[PDB]
Design an enzyme around this catalytic site. Sequence first.
Site, PDB file in Angstrom:
ATOM      1  N   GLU A 109       0.839  -1.157   0.061  1.00 26.50           N
ATOM      2  CA  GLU A 109      -0.021  -0.052   0.004  1.00 26.50           C
ATOM      3  C   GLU A 109       0.968   1.233  -0.082  1.00 26.50           C
ATOM      4  OE1 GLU A 109      -3.212   0.243  -0.386  1.00 26.50           O
ATOM      5  OE2 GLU A 109      -3.916  -1.730  -0.219  1.00 26.50           O
ATOM      6  N   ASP A 110       1.718   1.386  -1.091  1.00 24.85           N
ATOM      7  CA  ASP A 110       2.678   2.547  -1.200  1.00 24.85           C
ATOM      8  C   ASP A 110       3.543   2.807   0.146  1.00 24.85           C
ATOM      9  OD1 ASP A 110       1.392   3.853  -3.851  1.00 24.85           O
ATOM     10  OD2 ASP A 110      -0.053   3.157  -2.805  1.00 24.85           O
ATOM     11  N   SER A 111       4.133   1.869   0.550  1.00 23.77           N
ATOM     12  CA  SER A 111       5.047   1.951   1.489  1.00 23.77           C
ATOM     13  C   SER A 111       6.354   1.364   0.946  1.00 23.77           C
ATOM     14  CB  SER A 111       4.728   1.433   2.790  1.00 23.77           C
ATOM     15  OG  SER A 111       4.319   0.148   2.835  1.00 23.77           O
TER      16      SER A 111
END
EC number: 2.7.7.6
Lengths: 351, 65, 127, 88, 48, 142, 138, 114, 137, 56, 44, 100
Positions: I3-5
Amino acid sequence: GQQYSSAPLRTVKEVQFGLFSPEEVRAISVAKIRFPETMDETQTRAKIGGLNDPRLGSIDRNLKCQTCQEGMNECPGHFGHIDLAKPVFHVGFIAKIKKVCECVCMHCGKLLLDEHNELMRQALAIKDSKKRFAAIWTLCKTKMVCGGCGNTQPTIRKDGLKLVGSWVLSTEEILNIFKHISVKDFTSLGFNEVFSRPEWMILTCLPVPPPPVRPSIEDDLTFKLADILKANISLETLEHNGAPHHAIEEAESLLQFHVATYMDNDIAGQPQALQKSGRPVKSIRARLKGKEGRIRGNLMGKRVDFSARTVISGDPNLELDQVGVPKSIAKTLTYPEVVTPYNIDRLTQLV
Amino acid sequence: MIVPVRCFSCGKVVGDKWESYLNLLQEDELDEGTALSRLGLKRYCCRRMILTHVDLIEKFLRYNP
Amino acid sequence: HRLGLIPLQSMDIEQLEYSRDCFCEDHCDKCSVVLTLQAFGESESTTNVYSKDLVIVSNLMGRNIGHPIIQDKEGNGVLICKLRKGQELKLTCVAKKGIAKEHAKWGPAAAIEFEYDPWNKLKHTDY
Amino acid sequence: KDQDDRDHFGKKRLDLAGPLLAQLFKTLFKKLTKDIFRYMQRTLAINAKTITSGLKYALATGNWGEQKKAMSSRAGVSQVLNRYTYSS
Amino acid sequence: RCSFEETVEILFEAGASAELDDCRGVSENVILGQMAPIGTGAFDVMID
Amino acid sequence: KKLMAQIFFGPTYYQRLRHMVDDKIHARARGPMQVLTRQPVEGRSRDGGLRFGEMERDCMIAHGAASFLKERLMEASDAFRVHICGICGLMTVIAKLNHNQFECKGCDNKIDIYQIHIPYAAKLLFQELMAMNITPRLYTDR
Amino acid sequence: SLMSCISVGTDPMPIITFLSEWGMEPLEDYVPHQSPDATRVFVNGVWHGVHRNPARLMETLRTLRRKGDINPEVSMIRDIREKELKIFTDAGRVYRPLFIVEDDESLGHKELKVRKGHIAKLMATEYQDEYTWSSLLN
Amino acid sequence: MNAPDRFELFLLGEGESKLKIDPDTKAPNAVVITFEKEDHTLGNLIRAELLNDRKVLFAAYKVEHPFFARFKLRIQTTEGYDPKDALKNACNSIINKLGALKTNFETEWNLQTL
Amino acid sequence: NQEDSMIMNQSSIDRGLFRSLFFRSYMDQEKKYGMSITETFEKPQRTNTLRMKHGTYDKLDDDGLIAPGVRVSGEDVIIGKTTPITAYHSKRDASTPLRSTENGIVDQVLVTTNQDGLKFVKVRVRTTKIPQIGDKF
Amino acid sequence: SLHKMSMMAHRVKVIPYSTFRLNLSVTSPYNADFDGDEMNLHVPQSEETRAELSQL
Amino acid sequence: LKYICAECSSKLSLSRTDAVRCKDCGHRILLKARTKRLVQFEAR
Amino acid sequence: SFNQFVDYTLQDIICEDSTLIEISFGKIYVTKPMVNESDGVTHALYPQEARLRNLTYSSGLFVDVKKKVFIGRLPIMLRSKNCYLSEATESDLYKLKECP
DNA sequence: ACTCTCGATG
RNA sequence: AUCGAGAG
Ligand SMILES: Nc1ncnc2c1ncn2[C@@H]1O[C@H](COP(=O)(O)CP(=O)(O)OP(=O)(O)O)[C@@H](O)[C@H]1O
Ligand SMILES: [Mg+2]
Ligand SMILES: [Mg+2]
Ligand SMILES: [Zn+2]
Ligand SMILES: [Zn+2]
Ligand SMILES: [Zn+2]
Ligand SMILES: [Zn+2]
Ligand SMILES: [Zn+2]
Ligand SMILES: [Zn+2]
């Protein structure tokens, strides 16, 4: 918390809204407001017996406050009052008042149609106050001639902060009219007996808000009350002394202006009454209007303690109902736990 | 700023290879690739570390304070 | 930072001791190696400050240690800083025994090449 | 012929430092010669602080049109130079 | 109704008509800071 | 051990943005309050609290947690004790404590008095309505 | 954009004088019924009269701009099918540089006026540091 | 700010023992041993060497969270075989193989040039 | 890294990957009044000044400023100024505290007069920020 | 906070570093990624209200 | 204490009740000198 | 834009719109950015010194009056005609503590 | 007609 | 208090 009170702790069950009768206004007050001067009087860090009296509430982190003491943290606000040289209009009622004068003829003080009429019987049958008033106002504003006192009821229109007549209505006149509508005619158009009367819509004397409403770090409300008091004294000066015809009227409309803009500053009238700093000034109406208002901004939702906020991250090794909380936040946020035999050891270790 | 002492990725010392690199570009008139190759920078992470770097300290030394 | 990344001689590092294990205050000669650095702009040209300018001060008492590695051809070592005309840099460095697990500056090796079964006969990889 | 395109960039203008400082200076200078007219009719003592403090105010606050909050140019005409990156 | 859109005028016309607030509305107890008749507060707890 | 699927691997120019956690992180447990509304101040730099917004209130209503909603709107924020006259139902009460002298000029009440717990913002609202010629009378009985 | 610029603004008066002294009839001496196909000339949104044979005038003006006699910033719009001529010296106009394509090439077709020689002179100026952008514009 | 000390990856804290032997309540004759201040480097090797012992029914290690330097190792052996002895045999085997590897590398290194 | 990390190599970080310098300037100025009333730059004591700050002033010098090089953290006092408004407690505190959530080292201190002849000071504090879990990239 | 699943009761696990760490499968009801998103956390102050949080 | 000028290499020691400007310069930009009490840096 | 304002617009603003009844205005002179200190001494102001001392990088306007005078100070855009940085070389910028 | 975070100027 | 920029 605070302190022990001998009074029982009760819960608010009902809220009965109503108008403020000048009688009850001056009866409630604990201080008269004569001087427009705020606090300092001839190089003195005190309070003159005019505006911001120590009776309304002391403001110097003292231990005394209008004999009742209790400092300034326990004591709420003690209201005052100021008497106007001439009665003025309450802005938020300008419409309503203008409607009442159309439901009742001048001088006399009686409804145009009674049970003798056919439609008025149907209009007065409604129990709902607003619907009844709305049903009568539409079936009474067409009446020009008229109990007796047959007078040709004038065509009233709004202009600034006064009212005209076509065959200029004075505020004192409308006061005298609303004073003679009696009780039976009040029930016929929404108003109440001892709570709200049309003879209270117009402002005879207005209550003065205590320092916990208009603090000083001076507040705009203090400046506006100073403007109202200034117009008032400037009116009284032109009334008791030399009183020209086309000079005191401007002062009456001036006091009317300041009082009207004291509550509502966003009116149809272009003069928004600026201040010394060029600011449009903050009226009481603007204090309540959302979303930054008092209701939506300080009552429906407000800032709280024991809260935290941080950037979030994913963690495959945490359970679904868990939350990864940083140690600093854990040391910051706290929970009150009462000492019991079950946890006295643990709590002692924590302390 | 100045040439990084060691490569971020692996850890090879590249700080002692800056000046030499410059020489290999101006003295021997080589291209960047061969110059980087001669300095023992086979892995493209260190090769990056030297090729990608901009020596800003030279512009910094232009001030008198 | 770049001082910390300077490669130092760690041959007899095994007969040196952790500062956290030694019974001395802060550091001593049995746990740490102290080396100074005194540089100053002399010429009109840029005066470079290398790792060779580091001078051991503490007592090595026989142990081959502390000496900054110089694989440089000219024999200068890691270019630490650059000085103008009147710029001065005076400091002292206390070097201690450490693990690369604690900080990458204590990394003895760079890149380790590693490959098994070049023909994918074990089929550990779906190409 | 169809309706005029009101979104056509050709029939639009961008006022930079020039025109803005021109309007502002015209205002402050007309105010200056007005005040000087007053000092003249009262009777070399020329209040130069008008132009200076005016320009400085309008350049600092970003509120174009001296100290009058009736201005529609309250959208910050002058802003603090963003210096986080050269590209910024 | 004052806690939505037209705020002040509602209070005005409610003050003129002298209305009675039952205080059994959610936002009303929210303003009063009392335990509103919501789920948990939808009843009373006594002792027998 | 090797990885089955091979990995897209190589140099890419990445940039570090200005948003770092230690400049964003915030936590407050009973801190400085405002003067007008007696509520937690606004801002992380001022050690302020976080606004329990209207939508949050709606969520707690949807859940059914009334006591929690009361806690957030009293103990967690501004909780004030006021005195109310049993007659007119206003905050005219001059409650001289430590002497039990609960006066009320305007109704002559010294024995029929009450005490309620409301947010200070509610008291502010009621006072502002009183100064605007409106009487938000507060009775405690049905 | 990288090459977009804002018009500084210049004086339209010499352009007006030029127009009047180059076969443009004054607006006060205009008779529509005896000259319907006359291109009306606009300057900064102002009608200064019409003009027959607009092509010669337009090529003249364009030549003067390309030479530099008329400020290169000034815009000149020849509308054929609408029979209008709009000259704008207005300040605040957003313009951009473009290569000029003219078919003056005898031994060839429609080609760029700029040649590799010009570019060589540009890179000569670049390597030396006398032939700049202004020289290209003039 | 909230970042833990680096030495917490290999230095044992206050009261923290190196190994924590716990009786596994699931299957009989099983055990779970908590290794503190250690990572995959030791765990994977010990686990891989515990599978060579043919008197070992189960042997698996895991790191419950990368934040903390520790891992759990579950061992299940046949009846009449204490798992601690399996761990000891595995360890000694590792040590012997490593020593032999060192000797071999040394002898091979003494025969090189440049 | 879902999730966009993203996951970043700590080892490379230790070698100076995406490290940064962060400078912050605090500007203060001595006030002036009509009757020659002037705020002064000094290191006030607890008995001579009102209010005061919860932080310590021990890092201040005689001129009420920090010598560049001294490490500061928490709510330390950067600039010491007092405003006078016999009698005990004859001064009000006007000291400037270091940011409650920040820390670092005093990089450079600038003392200069104003255009109106007012002694004012800009203090620049330096802090090296190292890419931590949660930093935006 | 669009729906009731935007405010949910979690169990605290104190961890190092300065981030609110949450499970992946709780992303959907909150509608939250980790490209700079920030969340808030409130703490009950009595047994009955934490009972409300844990049981509702 | 002592101070040092900005656009010139000097070493003023003018304490309070002196301030601006500089010795043989003309400009009023004055920086403060480094502390004598050394600070340590964890070379990491 | 700024150069257009200084070299052309300003004169038009002063001359074409102002005349009193007499005192007619004349040419406008724009100096280099200076500062009138509290010390009384007026001297040249450089951008670095302006930003450091919270000063205003502005020049002075001077108009000829008929029947010379200082009418105010105009903030000067950096790297303009009336800025020291325009005719300045790279080494000059380095000496003036201004980034090239 | 949602929460945050900084800066500026009065 | 207002305004400006920015974060999901
Ligand atoms: N005015 C506003 N009100 C509420 N939320 C807002 C908002 N402005 C932005 N947001 C929040 O900011 C988020 C923006 O994230 P985005 O990256 O735009 C979603 P996406 O990348 O298209 O979906 P994906 O993660 O499924 O690929 C929105 O989901 C929204 O919740
Ligand atoms: Mg997403
Ligand atoms: Mg997001
Ligand atoms: Zn009191
Ligand atoms: Zn009648
Ligand atoms: Zn590498
Ligand atoms: Zn030692
Ligand atoms: Zn009462
Ligand atoms: Zn000097």
